[PDB]
Structure 1
Amino acid sequence: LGLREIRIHLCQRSPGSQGVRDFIEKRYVELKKANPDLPILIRECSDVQPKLWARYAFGQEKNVSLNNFSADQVTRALENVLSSKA
């Protein structure tokens, strides 16, 4: 019936999350200026793989692998999940 939260995991130093970092350094703020009541939790770690977890209504959750993604591919996947509302 609708998404409720977005969770984006990354690493500080690894290159595989680097493009994901290139999203956060560029286009995150306008995202928080676009959906102010939608919590997009950014979680940094040390050696984890890039990932994108979305929670929907009644506990439904989907997973997207953001491994070795560039900034524009991350933007495409994230606009897909916010515009999905499955």
Structure 2
Amino acid sequence: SSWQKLIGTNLRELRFVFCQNSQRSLGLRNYIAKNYWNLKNQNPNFPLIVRECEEADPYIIARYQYGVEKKAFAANNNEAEIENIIKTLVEQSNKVNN
């Protein structure tokens, strides 16, 4: 919601590396598939990269100013857990930037 809207102003990139055929990445894959349109529409200018590998470890990386890396594991994380991780990473920018 509001955290989804503030992503365009909080960070500089959002990367979702997952595995197409992994249970640990199944939750992340479902979360990316279901809610892709809302974030793409509300923040059309925010780089939102999505990548999948056969045996990738599920990582959601928030890249903030000065190329600050905020990779967080999302392996076997539920959709609510994925949303909480997104909210947290979209809220750490002020602490990370300062």
- TM-score (ref. length: structure 1): 0.88
Q: Which runs of 4+ in 1 moved over 4 A?
A: none
Is the CA contact 2:62–2:90 (under 8 Å) kept in the aligned structure 1? no
1:72 and 2:54 aligned? no
Higher RCO (CA 8 Å, separation ≥ 6 residues) = 1
The one-letter code of the counterpart of 1:63 is K
The partner residue of 2:44 within 36, 49, 60 is 36
The partner residue of 2:19 within 11, 15, 21 is 11
**How far apart are 1:25 and its partner, in Å?**
2.4
- Paired residue secondary structure (1:33): helix
Indicate the residue corresponding to 2:54 in structure 1.
46
Q: What is the distance in 2 between the residues matched to 1:61 and 1:22?
A: 24
**How far apart are 1:57 and its partner, in Å?**
1.0
Structure 1 or 2: more helix by fraction = 2
- In the alignment, structure 2 segments of 5+ residues that lack a partner are 1-8
- In the alignment, structure 1 segments of 5+ residues that lack a partner are none
Cα RMSD, aligned residues only: 1.7
- Paired residue secondary structure (2:50): strand
The partner residue of 1:23 within 24, 31, 48 is 31
**How far apart are 1:85 and its partner, in Å?**
2.3
- Identity across aligned pairs (percent)? 34
- TM-score (ref. length: structure 2): 0.78
